[PDB]
Amino acid sequence: LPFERATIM
Amino acid sequence: MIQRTPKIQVYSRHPAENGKSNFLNCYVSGFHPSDIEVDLLKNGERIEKVEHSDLSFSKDWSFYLLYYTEFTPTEKDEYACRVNHVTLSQPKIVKWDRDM
Amino acid sequence: GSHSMRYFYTAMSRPGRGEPRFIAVGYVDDTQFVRFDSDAASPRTEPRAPWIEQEGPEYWDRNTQIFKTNTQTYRESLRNLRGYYNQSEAGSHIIQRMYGCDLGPDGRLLRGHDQSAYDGKDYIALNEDLSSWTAADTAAQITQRKWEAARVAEQLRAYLEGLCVEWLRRYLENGKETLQRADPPKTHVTHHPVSDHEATLRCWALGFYPAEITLTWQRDGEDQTQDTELVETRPAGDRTFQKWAAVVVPSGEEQRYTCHVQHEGLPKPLTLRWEP
Numbered sequence: 001l002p003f004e005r006a007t008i009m
Numbered sequence: 010m011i012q013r014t015p016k017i018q019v020y021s022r023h024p025a026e027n028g029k030s031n032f033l034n035c036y037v038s039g040f041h042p043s044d045i046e047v048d049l050l051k052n053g054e055r056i057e058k059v060e061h062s063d064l065s066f067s068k069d070w071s072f073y074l075l076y077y078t079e080f081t082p083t084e085k086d087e088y089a090c091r092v093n094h095v096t097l098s099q100p101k102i103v104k105w106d107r108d109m
Numbered sequence: 110g111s112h113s114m115r116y117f118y119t120a121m122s123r124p125g126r127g128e129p130r131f132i133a134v135g136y137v138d139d140t141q142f143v144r145f146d147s148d149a150a151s152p153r154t155e156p157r158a159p160w161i162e163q164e165g166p167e168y169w170d171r172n173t174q175i176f177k178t179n180t181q182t183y184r185e186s187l188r189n190l191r192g193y194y195n196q197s198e199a200g201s202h203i204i205q206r207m208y209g210c211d212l213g214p215d216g217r218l219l220r221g222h223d224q225s226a227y228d229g230k231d232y233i234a235l236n237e238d239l240s241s242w243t244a245a246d247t248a249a250q251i252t253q254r255k256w257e258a259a260r261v262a263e264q265l266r267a268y269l270e271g272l273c274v275e276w277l278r279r280y281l282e283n284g285k286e287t288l289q290r291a292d293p294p295k296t297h298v299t300h301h302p303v304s305d306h307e308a309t310l311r312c313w314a315l316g317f318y319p320a321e322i323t324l325t326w327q328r329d330g331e332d333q334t335q336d337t338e339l340v341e342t343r344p345a346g347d348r349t350f351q352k353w354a355a356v357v358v359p360s361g362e363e364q365r366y367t368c369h370v371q372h373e374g375l376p377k378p379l380t381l382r383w384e385p
Contacts, residue, residue, distance in 0.1 A: 001272055001273075003264075004268070004272075006183075007182065008182055008185045008255065009186035011230065013229070024315075034344075036343045036344065039341075043121060062141075063146075066205060072119075108301065
């Protein structure tokens with residue numbers, strides 16, 4: 001299962 | 010930009026035996042950026058129904074893909090892989106060799 | 110019995126040819142098990158190994174939500190990084206990301222990983238402590254500052270020590286017949302004259318899994334490192350991998366040469382010779 005948060009770079 | 014040219018290997022899934030159905034593979038690797046064109050050839054002609062693996066990459070960030078198709082090797086049909094990439098002036102052809 | 114899980118993200122801009130393409134793939138060891146492609150006719154997480162197919166609709170929907178959000182997030186990141194480097198709107202660029210967790214043979218977390226790259230160059234990486242970042246340049250420091258403000262490392266650490274490990278161990282149990290089965294290489298040695306006075310000995314390894322293997326030639330029981338032609342390990346297409354190693358030897362010193370094979374699948378390391 002992948003990491004749940006996306007964070008803009 | 011730093012660009013890396015692909016390595017190319019052409020080979021069969023199983024030991025090659027004339028008149029026995031098998032798979033013809035062309036593995037491209039160590040390249041960057043990811044856009045690439047790969048065809049499989051039978052006596053110079055583009056094979057139609059070729060499939061390929063999903064785009065992934067190695068620990069050094071370079072991309073790799075497997076292209077493959079069903080085929081029946083014979084004593085005298087010639088097989089090859091044709092590759093083009095931004096790093097290459099004109100396409101590269103690598104011939105299928107049974108001992109390679 | 111050491112195992113790992115990794116996800117691999119590639120985001121690629123293509124000015125004049127639509128919005129950037131985002132694709133995620135997931136692996137356990139050398140086995141891919143899921144994909145998502147923002148270009149696919151209907152973008153959704155799809156299974157790529159039989160043992161994942163048993164997961165329910167809530168798994169598939171959950172994955173698809175995350176990858177859809179990542180598609181949009183990475184589109185902004187591409188815009189941001191082009192700015193950080195003062196780059197023109199005309200060229201195509203790539204952000205890559207790889208992350209996941211390693212387990213030891215006991216099933217306990219050996220270590221976590223999270224690394225990103227830009228145009229194939231290291232950009233930002235989570236340090237092994239899972240609490241701090243290594244930024245490659247002044248552009249990456251801007252990303253580092255954004256990521257500290259959102260408490261990213263803290264979120265990664267909870268994931269890598271928690272869910273990542275728990276799901277890896279689930280996959281390993283559900284796919285145990287393949288994921289925890291090592292297939293040893295089938296091996297032989299071939300001999301081909303190159304000239305009257307020299308021949309090629311080629312040591313072949315086929316049908317093995319996982320991909321990790323060591324193939325070496327020796328002359329009188331010493332390593333022939335600089336003289337061995339060593340081909341990159343390659344996928345057969347049926348889950349298994351292939352490799353060979355070759356040496357050019359004087360005729361007929363052939364019997365002074367030995368091929369050595371190490372692989373997790375084997376009862377014992379192998380020593381092979383050309384058998385005329």
